Amino acid sequence: SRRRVVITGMGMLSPLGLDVPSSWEGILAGRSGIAPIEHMDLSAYSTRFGGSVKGFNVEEYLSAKEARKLDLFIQYGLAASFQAVRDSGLEVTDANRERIGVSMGSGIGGLTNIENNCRSLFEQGPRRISPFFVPGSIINMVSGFLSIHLGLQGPNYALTTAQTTGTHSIGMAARNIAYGEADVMVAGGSEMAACGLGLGGFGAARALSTRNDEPTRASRPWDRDRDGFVLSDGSGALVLEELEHARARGARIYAELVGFGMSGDAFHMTAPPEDGAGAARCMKNALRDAGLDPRQVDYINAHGTSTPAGDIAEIAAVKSVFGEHAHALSMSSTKSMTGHLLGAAGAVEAIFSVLALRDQVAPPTINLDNPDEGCDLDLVAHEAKPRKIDVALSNSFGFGGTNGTLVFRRFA
Amino acid sequence: SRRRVVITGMGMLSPLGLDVPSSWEGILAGRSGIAPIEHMDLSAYSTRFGGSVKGFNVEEYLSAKEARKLDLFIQYGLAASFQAVRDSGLEVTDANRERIGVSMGSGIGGLTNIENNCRSLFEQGPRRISPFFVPGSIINMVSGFLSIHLGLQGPNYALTTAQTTGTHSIGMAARNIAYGEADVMVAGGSEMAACGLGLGGFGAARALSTRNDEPTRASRPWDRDRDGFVLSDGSGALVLEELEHARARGARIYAELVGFGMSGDAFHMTAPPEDGAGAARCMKNALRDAGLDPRQVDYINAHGTSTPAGDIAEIAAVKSVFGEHAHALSMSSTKSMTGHLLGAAGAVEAIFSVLALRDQVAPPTINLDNPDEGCDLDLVAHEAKPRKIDVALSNSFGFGGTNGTLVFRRFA
Ligand SMILES: COc1ccc(NCc2ccc(F)cc2)cc1
């Protein structure tokens, strides 16, 4: 019968910091992590900025020997995973290693590695492709390498649901524990898509903000002057744990994961429907899964990408689901500060939602100077809002019309 | 308590054929789909052959214009998915569309598109990158395009667990139905990694057979002269359906899916442990999930990749799990004929396991001329073996030590 799932450990690399506390301090202070990109010449590109991880030292985690084999998205996912496991206090033993698994996802995986090996193939020939190209680039190898380093023998998999990945990874990992397939899961996502192929590919779709002359103001969810998402890098990982397992070992519990929803839009390969129908179906699944009155929802960490169509679809969905209570909850987009970490977005945002519960504060939507037509909810414009938060919802939406919602609440 | 899951529809593209019955006819005849790769200069590569899909006509499924937006691996996944849904007879309605979902995965996704967009980027710069590059290449777009085309609003996701993808996709879709999150799922995988990057990437790791002179003899699982796997393309899709739902509409039921196991080796990035301890845990987990004793197993569709270490690990795993019954079951690698479809391997081999149940026949391991040291099980060398099959397993063991096992049973 379905068991309860709690969060005992969290870990992160973001554009705001090299761990959770440093990232969260930036979130509550309204700081932007967005800056012109330094790692490549982007003069031929329409977008030349994004949310980079600043000062990442892989030798805090891995030998230089091993680090050289791995795409940055794997390095970031392992860094977040190691933080989360250490934060949990969990000791892996022969008695429990079969009951601990990992579901760390990515939207794109090792794009830097692919580009670099494609350059070798075209300029030199196939004999110059790295022997480590496949195991060092493909998406499941955060789950794989973490399992090898910590001896995790439980369910070992990876989701790839584009901008929904982190949310789906956490929800499905919670189902593994709920249904008895595991007692512990490390789950979340990681992404490093900031190479020519990534900025070029999103650029070709005209999906990205082109505010190159003022990057900290580019990401402006629900602002009438928004012009697309800001591409960002990093990782979130959480340790999910069966409740009685956590209680038995005296774990610190941050919050309980009470609900998870998925739905497909079945609308369009890339565009969300303007009315938010799929996001509404997804949230209602998640609230019913959590056994909640929708009026119990205090805080929503929106997907809030700063696209014209996405941001308005989310208002329409929240109004449809919550009716008059839509005017009582607080909803914010931390992408205003972090940008869009794509497959890691739902992972860092799940962590921000849990910290909103721990600290009783709604993070701000920075840059919300002129709310667009119909964007008239409490969007926590400019400044963090201390408030009562018993229930927090984290939403994600992605290419293929794929929707995820996580529902967290305080644990006593 | 759990609902029962049955298979009511199957679809496939393989190196043996453009549908299930053509592919299966090849399998029971011991035919190879392996040949030198055409319309591609592989002079500089150590492997010049593999399993290509021959004469695929995407315009049976899509307009030319919609096909130009999608990587081959997406085309192949959609072809198998549309076949599977047709074969099921299912009518999607407003009354059931929220209960029908998709989980079609890939190990590598859009390598051909990545390669062609790299070419444009390096030669001409980012302004020649296709606008459809990202949504036409990312792994969740089979689930996405299928949901949009058929109006599916149920769980929409994609797994990427390397060579385990197709098995995990089917197993986790089965869990969705068993635990009441959906009534119908389309599940499986697709792969098209025959470009410079795929042949070059696996080749750089010296993971591929280099038997260029005799491509049909390259894939020789458990044979003492095997020298690595053969890279193959295609797709498999199954319609999974809650039993009472299948019976109420008079569906043709092929078989029941009674068990799913997952484990992690936690051993090595690309090699299994010599004793297959992870594969043994995974099969034991799958049989426990099915409430079956190892002695009830009749037929195993092996992972059987034709790698030195992989093939011997599976023999050790089977001897460990099945003890005095290990010689009584039949175990065959259809990869002897199809080669290794990576993320689609588990999907086409689940279909072959179901068909082994329908037709009471163990498919051959072709090329098993000189069984290696300790390869003394019934490996169905050279020719198909009619036999009693009530319970069939299908195993997948991939990079990162990620394992999957499906248990299928005759339905009456
Ligand atoms: C935007 O284009 C894409 C980028 C990545 C992927 N898949 C993951 C992946 C494939 C091959 C690798 F070597 C490493 C990762 C597909 C499409």
Q: Among partner residues B108, B141, B147, which is closest to A264 by beta-carbon distance?
A: B147
Instruction: Name chain A contacts of B205, Cβ cutoff 8 Å.
Output: 131-135
Q: Which of B63, B102, B161, B210 to mutate to test the interface with A (most CBs of A within 10 A)?
A: B161
For residue B1, tell me if it sits in a domain. Answer: no
User: Is the CB of B44 less than 8 angstroms away from the CB of A168?
Assistant: no
Chosen domain end from A227, A259, A291: A259
Domains of chain A: total? 2
- Distance of alpha carbon A153 from alpha carbon A182, whole angstroms: 10
CA B28 vs CA B8, B346, B369, B386: distances in Å: 22, 18, 18, 10
User: A323 and A384 in one domain?
Assistant: yes
Alpha helix stretches (DSSP H) within B291-399: 308-322, 335-338, 345-359
* A403: its two tokens: 């929707």
Helices B111-124 and B72-88 pack at an angle, to 10 degrees, of 150
Measuring CA to CA, how many Å separate B157 from each of A161, A166, A283, B187? 6, 12, 17, 10
The answer as to whether B157 is a domain residue is yes
Phi, psi of B166 (to 5 degrees): -60, -35
**Determination technique for this entry:** X-ray
Q: Are A365 and A400 found together in one domain?
A: yes
Q: Are residues B208 and B276 in the same domain?
A: no
Are residues B273 and B245 located together in one domain of the fold?
no
* Rounded CA separation B230/B221 (Å): 11
Q: Establish if B78 belongs to a structural domain.
A: yes
Q: With DSSP H G I counted as helix, E B as strand and the rest as coil, what are the percentages for chain B, rounded to 5?
A: 40, 20, 40
Rg (CA), chain A: 20
Q: Is A196 helix (H, G, I), strand (E, B) or coil?
A: helix
B129, B139, B231, best to mutate for ligand 1 pocket (most atoms within 8 Å of CB): B139
How many residues are recorded in chain A? 412
Q: What is the extent of the structural domain holding A362? A: 260-412
- Asked if A251 and A96 count as a contact pair (C-beta separation under 8 A), the reply is no
Cβ atoms B305, B335 nearer than 8 A: yes
Instruction: For chain B, give the number of residues.
Output: 412
User: Which helix (H) or strand (E) segment is A286 a member of?
Assistant: helix A277-289
**CA–CA distances in Å: residue B380 to residues A62, A214, A293, B340, B367:** 45, 67, 59, 19, 11
Same-domain check for residues A126 and A231: yes
Q: Suggest the residue from A108, A161, A175 to mutate for an interface test with chain B (most B CBs closer than 10 A).
A: A161
CB–CB contact A161 B158 (8 Å): yes
User: Distance, in angstroms, between A105 CA and closest chain B CA?
Assistant: 9
CB distance A403 to A278 below 8 Å: yes
Backbone region of residue B34 per phi and psi (left: phi > 0; alpha: psi in -120 to 50; beta: other values): beta
Instruction: For A372-381, give one letter per residue: b (16+ CB within 10 A) or e.
Output: beebebbbbb
- Angle, alpha carbons A307-A309-A312 (nearest 5°): 100
Question: The tokens 């081959």 sit on which residue?
Answer: B72
Claim to verify: residue A294 and residue A364 sit in the same structural domain = yes
Quick one: DSSP state of residue B220? -
Scan for tokens 């042949």, then name that residue.
Answer: B199
Sign of CA dihedral A173, A176, A177, A182: negative
A267 and B101: CB-CB below 8 Å?
A: no
CA of B395 to the centre of ligand 1 (A): 25
* Angle of CA points A59, A88, A411, to nearest 5°: 145
Residue pair A3/A243 in contact (Cβ under 8 Å)? The answer is: yes
Atom index in ligand 1 nearest the CA of residue A137 equals 14
Q: State how far residue A163 is from chain B, nearest Cα, in angstroms.
A: 10
For atom 5 of ligand 1, the residue with the nearest CA is: A108
Cα of A257 vs its chain's centroid, Å:
16
Of A150, A175, A263, the CB nearest to B153: A263
A384: Cα separation from own chain's centroid = 20
Q: Kindly state whether residues B316 and B397 are assigned to the same domain.
A: yes
Does A100 share its domain with A211?
A: yes
Where does a domain end: B209, B224, B259?
B259
Tell me, yes or no, whether B265 and B251 share the same domain: no
**Tokens representing A32?**
């932007």
Residues B274 and B396 placed together within one structural domain of the fold = yes
Q: Does B252 reside within a domain?
A: yes
Distance from CA of A370 to the nearest CA of B (A): 30
What is the Cα–Cα distance from B170 to B182, expressed in whole angstroms? 13
How far is CA B362 from each of CA A362, B28, B217, B326, B358, rounded to the nearest angstrom?
A: 61, 8, 20, 15, 11
Q: Is B137 within a domain?
A: yes
Nearest Cα to Cα of residue B142 among A342, A402, A183? A402
Q: Rounded to an integer, what distance in angstroms lies between the CA atom of residue A209 and that of residue A46?
A: 9
User: Is A1 domain-assigned?
Assistant: no
Residue pairs spanning A and B at CB distance below 8 A: 279
Other beta carbons within 10 Å of B39: 5
Residues 6 or more apart whose Cβ sits within 8 Å of residue B142: B73, B74, B77, B78, B81, B102, B104, B105, B106, B158, B190
Which of A140, A146, A282 has the highest number of chain B CBs within 10 A, making it the mutation to test binding with B? A140
Taking CA–CA distances from B127, the nearest residue in chain A reads A204
Which whole-number Å values give the CA distances from B402 to A72, A101, A165, B226, B405, in the listed order? 21, 11, 19, 23, 11
Phi, psi of A396 (to 5 degrees): -140, 150
Which chain A residues touch B105 with a CB distance below 8 Å? 160
Ligand 1 binding pocket (C-beta < 6 A) is A 108-111, 114, 137-139, 201; B 108-111, 114, 134, 137-139
Resolution (A): 1.6
Question: Of B236, B259, B282, which residue constitutes the final position of a domain?
Answer: B259
Please give, rounded to a whole number of angstroms, the shortest distance from the CA of A22 to a CA of chain B.
31
Which residues of chain A neighbour B145 with C-beta distances below 8 Å? Answer: 269, 400
